[PDB]
Nucleic acid binder design. Structure first.
Ligand SMILES: *O[C@H]1[C@@H](O)[C@H](n2cnc3c(=O)[nH]c(N)nc32)O[C@@H]1COP(=O)(O)OP(=O)(O)OP(=O)(O)O
Lengths: 336, 924
DNA sequence: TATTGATATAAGTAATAAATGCAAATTG
DNA sequence: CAATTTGCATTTACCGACAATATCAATA
RNA sequence: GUAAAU
């Protein structure tokens, strides 16, 4: 139905703002066949779906043609890409808008005050079958946007007040490697910890075949990535491009104290857990030595620790009478 | 006791001299006890406090704080002794080259000999005081940054070691200081204990416990780790309750004995405390050059000027102090004092399930409120400390020894209380000596009051008429300073006006005004000192006339002229659509154009002018936060108006800037014994150096500092090495040559004038541009000022500056490109190939520089054979001397060693500087 | 066997390309 | 070389500025 | 950031 763009039209454009895109419908066809969207979403006809950073829109056209959803909306502010989309998708059932996804005011006004795009709030038990989001944050310096969305998953304020909203997110390969680390790996950091705690993602597609060495080889089997050549993405120069799907899950911890503990226990990663608890606060080392009875935990580095024992350490830290200003600081570290 | 009133009541001058001599011989001991720092004294103070509190009882008080500090030291001493014994046991044959883990290899040999010298208890006291001295510093809410703490501990150990050594060489590297500091701080972290009390989230009852007083930790700021030491809140409250400053080192205070005269840079100012003539922050080149100049003996006049500046005695004002005390006792904010803020208030916690914009706004509100509260607290503490100094020193002789920054401007040693402070600190200081008012005292005192209201651009007759038109207001304001007419608080400089109103009330009450004795200094404020110096350099005529150089009976103010020019420009431009003109056409005052015009000749870009006018437009009702569009428009119009107003100054500015650019991009010959190793691009190690008429050498440090990580016990600190050398900064030298040159010329003039006034037996106090003397000796001071300015500017200073540059940077070689088609370029290629084909190297620039240095060694020596050899030895630099137009020569290619040439001096004008002897309206 | 250089960290004080605020300067 | 880039007059003092630290990479 | 000077 909707005319999918071609390589010539894309090459006619001048600026892409550093975002890399894929433009062969075959890879999107096999990705949609493998990804199993239709199993989670019982009725794609009633599905209301939001898209962030569309850009080319080839994936947009393929999605609309194959599924025909109730409403698929494109949010862009880049001038050249907006003109390109307006020219190609003229009079289309596809809804093209001109708003910047970076600002929270965009979502606030588009959902509450203007009511143009109104998703339906559901319970936080199962995946929201009536709401889906797609993002294409592949910029060099736009990792902060992905990390803030990941935090909003835990905080439940940005779009996850509606429930268990599924995201299909395009990210650079290095960001995926940081965000898909396992305990014991050298890529483990707080970003991996928050990803593991809040979500259970599954990598789907990746450009560079040699890039697979970064990820855990054990998980690649059950992830089964779809490999596509580096020449497939139009901005050939640049870092590889990966795909991850985001499924928020329920959590039983307090976000603020757990965040404090994970942030202050990830500054010293390779140091053993025996001597790192002093960084938490005055005299915390003695209390944590007294309270902890599992010695293997004390013999494990913070990289080796998974989110379960991080929740455990937070639970022990709550009962500590002499706790520091974990929340009483109220994020007041430095004005400069 | 009130010694000032006793001195004033003395009838006979001989009695006054005897009283002064007795006061000095008695107060030598008080000065000695005030100046000495307390480390050992702190030791027995803590010991005595602990031994007396062991019998009475146990409490949580300041005495308890001293007791716990004594216990901390007592537990430290075994640990320090154990560590030093461990270090000393390693001094036998060093059997293991790399065994003993890594501590022995990297740290034990690193700081072995350094710890074994100073007595252990002294270092323990040093580190304890250092950590309990700098709470909440460097941006940390309740602690200090690790690097600053360890470096400060190392430097304090340095000072203590040198103080011990002189009473019985080498200055330690930065890494050694960092390691020693880290070792001591980690040991104190280990040994620090304090009892704490807290609530239990499971029992909801108090559970007494013990936690270390200090705890290491890390914090983030915009994706950057930052090591931080933390102090327990109980210690914070105890330090807050520890009076204001009792045990935390008071180091620099006004003296009581007359200062020791300057003879050499190391010996001056305080008696038993070493001092330096130049405030060299971290540069060794300035220290070396100053030491060389002092050894040569060409800075005598600077010494005399500083001695005269520091020889004047001061007293704290009494009536103004009473007014300040009554204002401060109300516990609120007056027109000047910010006040004391009681509590910290925050907005309530927003719901977590709220839009992230709300949480971000809440975070910014919390940060802003915390910053405002802390700024108010800091201002209150500063004002309180100033008032404590004023009360402690009330009614006694005060002396303010001075130093010079690297340019040459004079600043007192006393940083907190001095005459350069704010208006409140300026009001509280008057001269100890009293002078007969005389026939001209009344006129000058009235002029001073007139120009403290901002009416300094009016004729003297208009000023005295204005002053004499408000006799009733002066009498009402002086009879009851507070709860009255409140006319003194409406002054541009309130408290100085209040003191002068006091003096005028007393002289008016007196039947005979001539015999009255007044201690109030009179401010003779120079008008456009930078522009005056620029006109005196370039010898301009119109520029001199607009800056009050020429004699006239009416003030000429450049700032008013440019303000009127801007107003007329906007009014012509306001006809069609300039809404910015509608907002700001009549709301243009002398202040904004004054700042911009006065800073323009120093090289202010668009951003600097925008920020200055934005700052000076905030209280002008335009806005409180967003004035940037109006500021940008006004800066554009001000630059458009000023582009043609100053022409002689701009030529000197451009010449100085381009000379700085040329000097900063040149490499010398001699120090290139080791190749720069880049093959093509050497590293530049030349900075602008020039000598003022007073003889003081100014070396613009402006070097690109490189920071590295050095391993310490606690962490790896990111610091720089001051002793290490590194290339100069490209932009700072060019941006700072003309401001430094102008700010040093006026400092030299002030030093000369102060020396002459001291030779004439006067009391002199100079705040950079402005000079303060008594209300009677103003005429002699003015004559001295004019004579000394004439003597200083009777020569073409820029010509001597160029001569100094030519003589100093004599054999310097620049690198530049040439066109391959040039015949001279082909000749240079032929010479280089012929020289370096047989040698083997590919005509590397390092070998060319070395052989040019060899030619300089041969052909410049007076040996006949050496001269013949130099005539028989030609290099690239030697060959390239036929044409004096180096820039016109060059106007891809191969770089060569072009010689260093400086541009021609801008044309000196035909103006007679001497004419301002009768120009009374020049410096007043 | 140390000794250097490289890179992630957090997470609104963004990124990008537009259009300067204007030299004065690298540099590709 | 025309096109892109970088920082923004100097100084002093005081407080809450002072891009910084840890871990994995390359080399002497 | 506040004060001080051009
Ligand atoms: O506006 C300033 C200020 O909030 C803060 N800041 C800088 N130096 C200090 C200091 O010594 N003490 C305090 N309390 N705050 C300080 O940084 C802000 C931004 O500064 P800039 O980036 O403009 O740099 P600089 O300090 O050079 O600015 P300026 O003083 O020349 O305007």
């Amino acid at each position: 139905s909707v005319p999918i763009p071609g390589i010539k039209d894309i090459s006619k454009l001048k600026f892409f703002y550093g975002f890399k895109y894929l433009w062969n419908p075959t890879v999107y066809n096999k990705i949609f066949d493998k990804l199993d969207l239709t199993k989670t979403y019982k009725h794609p006809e009633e599905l209301k779906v939001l898209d962030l950073y569309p850009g080319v829109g080839i994936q947009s056209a393929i999605f609309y043609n194959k599924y025909c959803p109730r409403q698929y909306s494109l949010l862009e502010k880049r001038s050249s890409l907006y003109k390109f989309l307006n020219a190609k998708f003229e009079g289309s059932p596809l809804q093209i808008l001109k708003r910047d996804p970076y600002d929270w005011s965009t979502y606030s006004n588009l959902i509450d005050e203007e009511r143009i795009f109104v998703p339906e709030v559901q319970s936080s038990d199962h995946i929201n079958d009536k709401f889906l989001t797609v993002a294409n944050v592949t910029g060099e310096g736009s990792e902060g946007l992905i990390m803030q969305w990941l935090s909003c998953i835990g905080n439940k304020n940005w779009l996850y007040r509606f429930g268990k909203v599924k995201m299909l997110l395009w990210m650079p390969s290095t960001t995926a490697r940081k965000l898909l680390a396992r305990p014991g790996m050298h890529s483990r950091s707080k970003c991996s910890v928050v990803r593991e705690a809040f979500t259970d993602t599954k990598l789907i597609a990746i450009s560079d075949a040699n890039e697979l060495k970064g990820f855990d080889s054990q998980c690649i089997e059950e992830w089964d990535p779809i490999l596509f050549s580096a020449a497939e993405i139009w901005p050939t120069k640049g870092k590889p491009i990966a795909l991850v799907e985001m499924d928020p899950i329920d959590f039983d911890f307090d976000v603020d104290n757990w965040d404090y503990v994970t942030r202050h226990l990830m500054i010293l990663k390779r140091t053993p857990l025996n001597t790192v608890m002093d960084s938490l606060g005055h005299g915390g080392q003695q209390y944590f030595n007294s309270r902890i009875t599992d010695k293997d935990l004390l013999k494990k580095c913070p990289i080796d620790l998974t989110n379960d024992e991080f929740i455990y350490l937070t639970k022990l830290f709550m009962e500590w009478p002499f706790k520091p200003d974990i929340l009483m600081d109220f994020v007041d570290m430095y004005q400069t | 006791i009130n010694f000032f009133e006793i001195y004033n009541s003395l009838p006979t001058l001989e009695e006054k001299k005897a009283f002064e001599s007795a006061l000095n011989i008695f107060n030598q001991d008080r000065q000695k006890v005030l100046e000495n720092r307390a480390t050992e004294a702190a030791r027995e103070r803590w010991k005595h406090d602990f031994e007396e509190a062991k019998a009475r009882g146990d409490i949580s008080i300041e005495k308890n704080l001293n007791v716990k500090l004594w216990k901390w030291y007592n537990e430290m001493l075994p640990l320090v002794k154990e560590e030093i014994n461990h270090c000393r046991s390693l001094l036998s044959e060093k059997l293991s080259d790399k065994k003993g883990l890594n501590k022995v290899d990297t740290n034990r040999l690193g700081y072995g000999p350094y710890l074994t010298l100073i007595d252990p208890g002294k270092m323990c006291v040093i580190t304890i005081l250092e950590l309990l001295k700098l709470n909440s510093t460097g941006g940390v809410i309740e602690g200090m940054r690790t690097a600053r703490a360890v470096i400060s501990v190392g430097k304090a150990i340095e000072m203590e070691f040198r103080s011990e050594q002189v009473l019985k060489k080498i200055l330690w590297p930065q890494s050694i200081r960092a390691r020693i500091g880290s070792v001591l701080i980690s040991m104190l972290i280990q040994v620090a204990k304090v009892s704490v009390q807290g609530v239990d989230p499971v029992t909801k009852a108090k559970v007494h416990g013990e936690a270390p007083a200090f705890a290491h930790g890390y914090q983030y700021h915009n994706g950057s780790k930052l090591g931080v030491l933390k102090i327990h809140k109980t210690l914070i409250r105890q330090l807050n309750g520890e009076r204001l400053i009792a045990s935390v080192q008071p180091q620099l205070l006004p003296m009581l004995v007359e200062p020791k005269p300057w003879v050499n840079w190391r010996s001056g100012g305080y008696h038993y405390t070493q001092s330096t003539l130049l405030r060299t922050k971290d540069s060794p080149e300035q220290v070396a050059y100053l030491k060389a100049a002092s050894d040569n003996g060409d800075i005598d006049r600077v010494y005399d000027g500083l001695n005269v500046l520091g020889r004047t005695p001061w007293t704290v004002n009494r009536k103004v102090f009473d007014v300040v005390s009554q204002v401060w006792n109300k516990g609120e904010g007056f027109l000047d004092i910010p006040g004391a803020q009681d509590e910290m208030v925050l907005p309530p916690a927003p719901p977590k399930n709220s839009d992230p914009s709300i949480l971000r706004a809440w975070k910014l509100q919390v940060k802003t409120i915390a910053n405002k509260f802390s700024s108010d607290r800091s201002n209150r503490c500063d004002t309180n400390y100033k008032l404590e100094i004023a009360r402690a020193f009330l009614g006694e002789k005060l002396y303010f020894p001075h130093n010079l920054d690297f340019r040459g401007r004079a600043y007192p040693l006393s940083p907190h209380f001095n005459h350069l402070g704010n208006d409140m600190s300026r009001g509280l200081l008057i001269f100890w000596h009293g002078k007969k008012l005389g026939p001209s005292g009344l006129k000058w005192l009235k002029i001073h009051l007139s120009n403290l209201f901002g009416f300094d651009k009016l004729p003297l007759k208009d000023r005295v008429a204005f002053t004499e038109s408000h006799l009733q207001d002066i009498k009402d304001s002086a009879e009851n300073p507070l709860t009255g007419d409140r006319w003194w608080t409406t002054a541009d400089k309130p408290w100085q006006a209040l003191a002068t109103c006091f003096e005028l009330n007393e002289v008016m009450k007196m039947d005979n005004p001539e015999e009255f004795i007044s201690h109030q200094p009179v401010h003779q404020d120079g008008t456009c000192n930078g522009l005056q110096h620029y006109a005196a350099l370039g010898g301009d005529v119109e520029g001199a006339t607009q800056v009050n150089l020429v004699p006239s009976d009416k003030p000429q103010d450049v700032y008013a002229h440019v303000a009127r020019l801007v107003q007329k420009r906007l009014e012509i431009a306001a006809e069609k659509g300039d809404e910015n003109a509608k907002i700001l056409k009549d709301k243009i005052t002398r202040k904004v154009v004054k700042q911009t015009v006065m800073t323009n000749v120093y090289g202010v870009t668009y951003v600097g002018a925008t920020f200055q006018i934005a700052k000076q437009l905030s209280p002008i009702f335009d806005d409180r936060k967003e004035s940037l569009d109006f500021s940008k428009y006004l800066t554009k119009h001000v630059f458009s108006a000023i582009r043609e107003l100053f022409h002689s100054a701009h030529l000197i500015q451009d010449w100085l800037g381009e000379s700085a650019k040329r000097i900063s991009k040149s490499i010398r010959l001699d120090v290139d014994e080791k190749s720069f190793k880049n093959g093509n691009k050497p590293d530049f190690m030349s900075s602008v150096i020039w000598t003022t008429p007073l003889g003081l050498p100014i070396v613009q440090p402006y070097r690109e500092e490189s920071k590295k990580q050095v391993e310490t016990n606690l962490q790896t600190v990111f610091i720089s090495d001051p002793f290490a050398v590194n290339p100069v900064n490209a932009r700072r030298q060019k941006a700072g040559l003309p401001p430094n040159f102008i700010h040093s010329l006026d400092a030299s003039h002030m030093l000369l004038s102060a020396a002459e006034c001291g030779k004439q037996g006067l009391d002199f106090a100079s705040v950079h541009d402005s000079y303060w003397t008594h209300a009677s000796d103003i005429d002699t001071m003015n004559v001295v000022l004019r004579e000394q300015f004439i003597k200083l500017h009777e020569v073409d200073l820029v010509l001597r500056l160029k001569e100094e540059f030519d003589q100093r940077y004599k054999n310097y070689v620049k690198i530049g490109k040439l066109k391959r088609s040039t015949d001279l370029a082909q000749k240079i290629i032929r010479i280089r190939k012929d020289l370096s084909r047989k040698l083997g190297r590919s005509t590397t620039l390092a070998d060319e520089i070395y052989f040019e240095k060899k030619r300089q060694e041969l052909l410049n020596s007076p040996l006949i054979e050496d001269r013949n050899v130099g005539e028989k030895m030609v290099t690239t630099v030697s060959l390239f001397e036929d044409i004096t137009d180096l820039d016109a020569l060059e106007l891809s290619g191969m770089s060569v060693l072009l010689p260093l040439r400086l541009p021609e001096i801008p044309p000196k004008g035909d103006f007679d500087v001497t004419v301002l002897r009768n120009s009374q309206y020049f410096f007043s």
